């Protein structure tokens, strides 16, 4: 073309996509913000689900969350655009200087990159917990706990990041010409290792983990565990009351159950807790856990393959300001976080659609166990506990909501 450039065109394409996706999500955010402002009256369908006092408490909470979501989101989108345009990343790469040498430079660049990321986002994080979560009486955290936890998490992150990054960069630089297969198999091992280690060693460092005390709930759970042939080791009661009044539950293994102390206490009755367990046990029995891993490793193989195909192109490096050298870590950032952006956005939308279908299947499994009436009462009680707005814009919930709306889940259980 005697009218358009090459490297400057692909850089513009990245930013043009990043802004259209942002404007799409902002249009969606505006569409749902209107729902919070318009629907001031309790609907006749969700009339028995929520009362006028709880509905208005939920209306203002989701409204304050929406306002923050915009400005915190806008700052991020502006920062990203400004760092790229100003040429922050290549200049930050230069200041982290002065195969082992490139890996060391990549390691210090990463240490500096994550340090700025953590510090710039910390005031926004501090606002959410101490202004939004505190105004609507959810937060139970002190400024000291928040600060001590932020450092705790940042330290633990770097101690996992640096050795994994150094070994991954080593495999790409040393290995070849089919380096992407060993690099994909390395991430495959690192994924399964960190999954088993996390809940047993990493997770108890930030939150107090204690096994469920013996009682009517503990005995009935073992009866249910033996019934579904679930290899239960122990049930855990996570001290989530030290952070916030929010209630939830999860499960892990290679097996142990994880339930919030806010859900057990106020919370949900023992009959409702067992129904919530029956739903979570559904993801194990229906193989939702195994299916999600198969998708994640299929995605990384496709990504590493296209990376190996595009790493050789010097045009993508020159686009973002890298002319003198083509660094490996920089190649991973440009291709995985910018070139793959359209694919990553489509895949995320497809996985959100799948997550909703996986939740309906786990709810259907809870009904198949007979605890349908108990789960119906639990879902409503947990919605009041977390001040969840029952009304939602269809276009917003279809794109963002990993869990289907309360009214949709309740109607499937009633049937």
């Amino acid at each position: 073309l005697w009218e358009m450039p090459a490297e400057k065109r692909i850089f513009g394409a990245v930013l043009l996509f990043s802004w259209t996706v942002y404007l799409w999500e902002t249009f969606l955010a505006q569409r749902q913000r209107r729902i919070y402002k318009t629907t001031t009256h309790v609907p006749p369908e969700l009339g028995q689900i929520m009362d006028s006092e709880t509905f208005e408490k939920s209306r203002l909470y989701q409204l304050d969350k929406s306002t923050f979501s915009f400005w915190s989101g806008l700052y991020s989108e502006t920062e990203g655009t400004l760092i790229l345009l100003f040429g922050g990343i290549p200049y930050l790469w230069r200041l982290s200087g002065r195969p082992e040498y490139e890996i060391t430079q990549s390691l210090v660049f990463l240490l500096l990159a994550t340090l700025f990321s953590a510090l710039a986002g910390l005031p926004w994080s501090l606002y959410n917990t101490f202004v939004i979560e505190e105004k609507h009486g959810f937060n139970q955290q002190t400024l000291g706990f928040f600060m001590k936890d932020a450092i705790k998490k940042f330290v633990v992150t770097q101690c996992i990041l640096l050795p994994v990054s150094s070994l991954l960069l080593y495999i790409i630089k040393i290995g070849g010409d089919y380096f992407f297969i060993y690099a994909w198999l390395f991430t495959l091992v690192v994924s399964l290792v960190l999954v088993t280690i996390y809940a047993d060693y990493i997770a108890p460092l930030f939150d107090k983990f204690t096994p469920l005390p013996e009682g009517k709930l503990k005995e009935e759970i073992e009866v249910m565990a033996k019934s579904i042939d679930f290899p239960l080791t122990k049930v855990y009661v996570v001290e989530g009351s030290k952070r916030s009044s929010h209630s939830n539950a999860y499960f892990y293994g290679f097996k142990r159950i994880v339930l919030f102390d806010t859900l057990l206490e106020q919370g949900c009755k023992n009959e409702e807790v067992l129904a919530v367990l029956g739903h979570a046990l559904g993801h194990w029995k229906l193989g939702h856990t195994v299916k999600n891993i198969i998708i994640s490793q299929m995605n990384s193989f496709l990504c590493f393959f296209l990376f190996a195909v595009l790493i050789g192109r010097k045009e993508l490096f020159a686009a973002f300001g890298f002319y003198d050298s083509q660094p490996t870590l920089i190649g991973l950032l440009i291709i995985f976080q910018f070139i793959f952006s359209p694919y990553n956005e489509v895949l995320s939308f497809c996985l959100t659609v799948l997550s909703r279908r996986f939740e309906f299947q786990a709810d259907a499994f809870a009904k198949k166990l007979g605890k349908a009436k108990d789960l119906y009462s639990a879902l409503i009680k947990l919605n009041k506990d977390n001040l969840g707005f029952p009304v939602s814009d269809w276009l917003f919930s279809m794109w963002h909501y990993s869990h289907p709306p309360l009214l949709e889940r309740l109607q499937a259980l009633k049937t």
Binding site: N248, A249, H279, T289, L382, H403
Partner: peptide
């Protein structure tokens, strides 16, 4: 997976 989760509940909420």
């Amino acid at each position: 997976c989760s509940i909420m």
